[model samples]
Target: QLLGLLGQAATVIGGEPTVSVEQLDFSAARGDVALQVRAPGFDVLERLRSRLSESGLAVQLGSASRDGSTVSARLVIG
Candidate 1:
């Protein structure tokens, strides 16, 4: 379900979208994991957040910055 949500966000952003898995746990003691979704630019990123929120998906967005022609934002979802 999270992957599907990410895919929708990527589509809304409209650029090379990618997912990076920071951690994974199979044990019941700790099943926490982290991921990051990189988008195209600040404008698109904002729209993505809005769309997700409007769809009733609560997400915490990170800082966004521009580097050359690329603008990126980070989101950590478990």
Candidate 2:
């Protein structure tokens, strides 16, 4: 579960109000994982981006979705 590990790392880095894994309904064999990160007053996001990239993980900033005061970043890893 490499994806799960990466998501955990993001959580440990203080990516507040973030979800490392999400369950989507469609097919039981297919599931999607998402990372919602917030680097409120620091360069956490940048560091994470670099780290993941260096580890052969393609991280991208797709878009921002908000629900009230909590905001999350959508990332795609290849």
Candidate 3:
């Protein structure tokens, strides 16, 4: 139920997570998640990853492709 787990955690955006998840072979609880966000600036991304890691979730960031103002961004959340 990692998807459900993630859904609750990612709800901080008030349901604005434009993201995708590849829950492959989760038989061992391993997979990848891709999340996109729109922020006032790029600096806001750290806490997102930080909190997840703090909770013991493994993650790495992938830079977003050009897309923002109201500043939009995307990341690889694993």
Candidate 4:
């Protein structure tokens, strides 16, 4: 549910591009949630990173690209 909210926030910031949750792993031993996010735009990616980090979620901004209006990014949250 929290991950869903993160995805939604990214969409709102990015102008409604398709946001897909490619993978998710909840680590009980590590006490963290690992997530894979594929979305568009620096606004979207940065927003997600900030929000998640603010909420105490460790977020890593992975590969990103801007081609025309299409902005794509890979993110990991834990």
Candidate 4 lDDT tens digits, 1-78: 456655654554355345556676665576545555565566777766786666555677777788776566666555
RMSD of every candidate to native, in Å, equals 5.3, 5.4, 5.4, 5.1
Q: What would the per-residue lDDT of candidate 2 be over residues 1-78, giving only the tens digit for each residue?
A: 555645554544444343333321222244333455544322444555666666556566555555565445655544
Clashes of each: 0, 0, 0, 0
Give one digit per residue, the lDDT tens place, for model 3 in 1-78: 468646645653333343333221232344555565555545555556566666666666556444445444555445
Ten contiguous residues with the weakest lDDT in model 1: 19-28
Select the stronger candidate by TM-score from 2 and 3.
3
Residue clash pairs of candidate 2: none
lDDT of each: 0.52, 0.48, 0.51, 0.61
Against the true structure, whose TM-score is highest? 1
How well does candidate 1 match the true structure, expressed as C-alpha RMSD?
5.3
**What is the total number of backbone clashes in candidate 1?**
0
Error of 4 at 67 (Å): 4.0
Better model by lDDT: candidate 2 vs candidate 4 = 4
Tens-digit per-residue lDDT, 1-78, candidate 1: 556655654454343243222332233343322334545567666666676666556655688787777665665433
Off by over 4 Å in 2: 1-32, 63-72
Query: Which segments of model 1 are wrong by more than 4 Å?
Result: 1-35
User: Comparing 1 and 2 by lDDT, which wins?
Assistant: 1
Q: Which ranking of candidates, highest TM-score first?
A: 1, 3, 4, 2
